[PDB]
Amino acid sequence: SGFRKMAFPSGKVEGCMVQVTCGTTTLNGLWLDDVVYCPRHVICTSEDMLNPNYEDLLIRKSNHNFLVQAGNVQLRVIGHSMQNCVLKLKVDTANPKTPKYKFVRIQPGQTFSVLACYNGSPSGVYQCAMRPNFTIKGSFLNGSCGSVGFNIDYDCVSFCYMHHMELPTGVHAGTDLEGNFYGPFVDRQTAQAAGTDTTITVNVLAWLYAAVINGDRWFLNRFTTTLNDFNLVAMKYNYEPLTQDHVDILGPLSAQTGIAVLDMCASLKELLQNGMNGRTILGSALLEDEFTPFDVVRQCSGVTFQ
Amino acid sequence: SGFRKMAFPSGKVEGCMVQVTCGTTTLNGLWLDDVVYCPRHVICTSEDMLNPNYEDLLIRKSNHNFLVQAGNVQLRVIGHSMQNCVLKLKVDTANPKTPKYKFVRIQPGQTFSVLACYNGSPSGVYQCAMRPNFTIKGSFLNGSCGSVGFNIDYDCVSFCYMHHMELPTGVHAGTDLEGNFYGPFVDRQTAQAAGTDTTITVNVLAWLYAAVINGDRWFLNRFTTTLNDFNLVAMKYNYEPLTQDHVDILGPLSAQTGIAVLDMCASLKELLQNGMNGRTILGSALLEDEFTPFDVVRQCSGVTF
Numbered sequence: 001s002g003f004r005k006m007a008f009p010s011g012k013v014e015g016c017m018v019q020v021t022c023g024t025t026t027l028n029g030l031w032l033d034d035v036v037y038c039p040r041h042v043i044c045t046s047e048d049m050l051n052p053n054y055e056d057l058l059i060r061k062s063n064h065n066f067l068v069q070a071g072n073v074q075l076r077v078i079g080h081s082m083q084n085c086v087l088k089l090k091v092d093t094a095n096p097k098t099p100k101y102k103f104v105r106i107q108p109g110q111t112f113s114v115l116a117c118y119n120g121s122p123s124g125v126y127q128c129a130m131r132p133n134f135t136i137k138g139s140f141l142n143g144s145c146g147s148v149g150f151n152i153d154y155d156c157v158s159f160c161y162m163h164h165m166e167l168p169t170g171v172h173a174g175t176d177l178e179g180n181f182y183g184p185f186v187d188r189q190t191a192q193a194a195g196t197d198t199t200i201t202v203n204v205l206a207w208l209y210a211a212v213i214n215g216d217r218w219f220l221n222r223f224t225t226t227l228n229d230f231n232l233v234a235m236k237y238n239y240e241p242l243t244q245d246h247v248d249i250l251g252p253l254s255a256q257t258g259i260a261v262l263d264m265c266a267s268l269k270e271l272l273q274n275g276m277n278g279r280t281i282l283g284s285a286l287l288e289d290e291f292t293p294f295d296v297v298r299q300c301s302g303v304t305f306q
Numbered sequence: 307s308g309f310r311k312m313a314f315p316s317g318k319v320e321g322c323m324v325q326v327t328c329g330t331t332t333l334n335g336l337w338l339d340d341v342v343y344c345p346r347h348v349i350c351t352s353e354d355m356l357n358p359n360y361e362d363l364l365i366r367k368s369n370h371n372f373l374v375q376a377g378n379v380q381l382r383v384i385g386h387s388m389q390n391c392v393l394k395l396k397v398d399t400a401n402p403k404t405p406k407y408k409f410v411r412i413q414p415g416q417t418f419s420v421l422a423c424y425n426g427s428p429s430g431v432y433q434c435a436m437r438p439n440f441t442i443k444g445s446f447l448n449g450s451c452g453s454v455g456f457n458i459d460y461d462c463v464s465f466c467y468m469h470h471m472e473l474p475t476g477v478h479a480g481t482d483l484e485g486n487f488y489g490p491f492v493d494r495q496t497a498q499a500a501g502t503d504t505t506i507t508v509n510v511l512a513w514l515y516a517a518v519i520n521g522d523r524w525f526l527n528r529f530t531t532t533l534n535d536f537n538l539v540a541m542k543y544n545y546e547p548l549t550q551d552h553v554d555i556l557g558p559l560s561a562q563t564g565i566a567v568l569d570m571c572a573s574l575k576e577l578l579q580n581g582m583n584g585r586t587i588l589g590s591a592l593l594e595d596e597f598t599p600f601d602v603v604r605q606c607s608g609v610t611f
């Protein structure tokens with residue numbers, strides 16, 4: 001029993017974190033085999049951020065201008081290249097702690113664990129989600145750039161996020177491990193405000209299914225809805241449209257609880273109209289949207305508390 | 307910016323988790339140097355659990371009755387002993403990944419990170435607090451016994467909890483690493499229940515300080531209160547009494563924001579009496595009490611390990 005925001009164990013990623021220094025700037029890097037991946041803005045001054053010409057800044061650098069530190073050992077940079085918004089530093093030592101891994105680009109609504117790091121040293125681990133507006137609600141301070149987001153389904157680490165910046169609203173933006181930003185953001189100091197965000201409907205439904213599995217049904221009702229009528233109501237509360245793919249993805253949770261997806265949609269419709277009336281669902285007074293259907297299946301019992 | 311329920315990095319603890327099997331029961335063990343620590347109830351059948359005589363059950367066991375597996379390697383048990391509700395299995399191999407550590411017993415209100423484990427394999431990490439009623443609101447299924455709770459202080463892991471059981475309300479109970487239970491719980495199948503819980507007042511104040519640091523100020527007001535008047539109000543809402551020690555512990559947060567502790571108490575008083583009036587604080591409609599003053603300082607300063 002219980003339901004917590006659960007992160008993957010971070011040890012496999014902790015063994016990959018290093019510190020990268022270029023002049024006066026120090027940030028984090030991810031060391032996998034003989035390559036250290038980090039944000040390309042490590043080569044910039046504050047002034048450079050207004051309209052940086054990364055190609056022109058980079059050509060003026062040698063391998064020995066990059067200092068990479070893994071614990072108390074200096075690694076030697078023997079090559080460098082830029083791929084989109086990341087810098088790839090070839091080092092003379094392969095990481096002996098390199099886990100089995102892949103680089104995966106995720107979609108909005110997907111969750112992952114973040115290992116917040118400063119000066120190449122991990123400070124904490126927390127869960128989060130790629131918001132519909134392609135930002136993440138992280139907890140990051142100056143010096144956290146290069147910290148990564150990942151999942152570890154079946155002993156292989158899937159790296160999906162590298163941290164680059166904090167936006168004016170206090171939310172965060174970054175790239176996949178190929179250096180492609182999520183959303184329309186650029187690694188430039190410009191007016192690029194996060195778009196209006198919405199609630200991840202499929203995740204709220206998954207979390208209602210978790211509440212039922214854990215033994216709570218108070219929010220259910222005798223009604224159903226069509227997918228289209230549900231979407232017309234959902235969009236009025238700033239909820240993402242629910243697609244047939246989302247209905248398919250909720251199938252196993254629907255089967256385990258005996259509650260049809262459109263029947264859970266009717267419950268969600270009523271919760272949006274009435275609120276919770278002094279009640280809580282899994283210890284929360286708000287509708288939680290940072291648990292996916294896959295996350296609920298991973299954490300919850302396979303036997304519903306009937 | 308941002309404020310999340312953050313756990314300590316778990317790698318130093320992951321390298322200590324092993325699987326312990328005794329007959330048909332499999333649970334988790336913590337391997338530090340040449341000893342594997344696990345709940346003593348690993349030696350019980352379901353029938354034994356109704357009324358166990360642990361000394362009599364243990365004397366009938368040989369070292370080879372305990373199967374300890376570290377990854378894909380069987381460790382050889384060369385000795386066994388019991389300390390309170392914890393069994394200590396001496397193994398023939400010292401753990402090469404043993405971190406610098408201590409066994410510490412925590413107080414209610416203190417938080418720790420849990421590394422949930424099944425079959426000796428870590429599955430997840432989350433943060434939680436020892437409730438005033440000595441239970442923890444964890445997330446655990448059958449097979450999670452032996453999973454541990456911990457904090458990290460520089461390079462040193464302070465192990466503070468070992469998971470033993472789930473209570474009827476879905477909350478959890480366990481021991482320190484010396485096998486002493488937190489709470490008036492016993493390791494047997496008998497009628498047991500969590501007592502009435504209260505809210506950890508000093509932690510709610512620390513989280514209001516975190517909200518101010520993160521730019522949420524709507525709940526601030528021009529008023530102050532005495533510690534005694536605040537406690538008269540707190541007692542009425544099932545909040546723990548606030549002591550002068552709690553006021554002293556909030557000093558650094560009071561200095562960083564410029565808001566006196568009793569001034570924040572006046573804000574908390576008004577929140578308890580009026581509710582939030584449709585507003586949220588750090589993305590929550592409830593007053594959060596599972597962040598200690600040290601947790602707020604650490605997250606708002608970027609302390610590393």
Ligand SMILES: O=C(CN1Cc2ccc(Cl)cc2[C@H](C(=O)Nc2cncc3ccccc23)C1)N[C@@]12C[C@@H]3C[C@@H](C[C@@](O)(C3)C1)C2
Pocket residue numbers: 041049140141142143144145164165166167168186187188189307
């Ligand atoms: O002044 C700077 C310095 N950055 C510029 C910058 C540009 C572009 C790129 Cl790609 C990276 C970066 C780097 C950055 O964002 N670092 C960080 C990352 N994660 C968490 C931070 C929290 C605090 C500070 C930096 C943080 C440094 N950043 C902000 C100060 C404050 C709060 C927000 C929004 C502001 O408008 C107002 C600009 C950030």
Ligand SMILES: O=C(CN1Cc2ccc(Cl)cc2[C@H](C(=O)Nc2cncc3ccccc23)C1)N[C@@]12C[C@@H]3C[C@@H](C[C@@](O)(C3)C1)C2
Pocket residue numbers: 001347355446447448449450451470471472473474492493494495496
């Ligand atoms: O029947 C048993 C068997 N246990 C007896 C027991 C006694 C004493 C001690 Cl020290 C340990 C243990 C062991 C235990 O609690 N294991 C576990 C630990 N963490 C999370 C569990 C989730 C599910 C199952 C076990 C879980 C096994 N457990 C409960 C089944 C269900 C939900 C609650 C409350 C119940 O009244 C109703 C009894 C547990």
Ligand SMILES: [Cl-]
Pocket residue numbers: 105106107110
């Ligand atoms: Cl995805």
Ligand SMILES: [Cl-]
Pocket residue numbers: 189190191
């Ligand atoms: Cl600008």
Ligand code: NA
Pocket residue numbers: 051052053
């Ligand atoms: Na340019």
